[PDB]
């Protein structure tokens, strides 16, 4: 049919939209991650939000995905983590469903990405030496 352009669904409006459709609004979620006894709890909350944001940024940086919302990596996808093909992931599921499925295969992927990024850095250093 005819169309009149894209639309804005809000901070978490794409939560119910498919993973492919939900990847179209990454910046919307990304923007909102940063913003005498009650002056302490407020400061604690602000500090905690800062630490969580910096932990996420540090992970992305040490995976080589600094400043990227969608980042390809050199780590292959072990079939044990998930045996589902793309047709039934990006067009028939939501990111929440993927998260509940994959939450028990998370840290190993993070470590593999860290080691792969370190290996890539060393390889690039060797290459530039020539």
């Amino acid at each position: 049919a005819v169309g009149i352009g894209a639309v804005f669904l809000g901070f978490l409006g794409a939560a119910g939209s498919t993973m492919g459709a939900a990847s179209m609004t990454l910046t919307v979620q990304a923007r909102n991650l940063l913003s005498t006894v009650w002056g302490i709890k407020q400061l604690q909350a602000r500090v905690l939000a800062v630490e969580r944001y910096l932990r996420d940024q540090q992970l992305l940086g040490i995976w080589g995905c600094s400043g990227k919302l969608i980042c390809c990596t050199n780590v292959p996808w072990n079939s044990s983590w998930s045996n589902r093909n793309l047709s039934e992931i990006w067009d028939n599921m939501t990111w929440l469903q993927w998260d509940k499925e994959i939450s028990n295969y998370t840290q190993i992927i993070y470590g593999l990405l860290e080691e792969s990024q370190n290996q890539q850095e060393k390889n690039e250093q060797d290459l530039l030496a020539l």
């Binding site: 978490l12 939560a15 609004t25 990304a30 919302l69 969608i70 050199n74 292959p76 996808w77 929440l96």
Partner: peptide, 16 residues
């Protein structure tokens, strides 16, 4: 045959 690789997405709408 699949030739699938890890891809990191930031800003995903998921909550706990």
């Amino acid at each position: 045959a699949e030739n699938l690789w890890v891809t990191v997405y930031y800003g995903v709408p998921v909550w706990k």
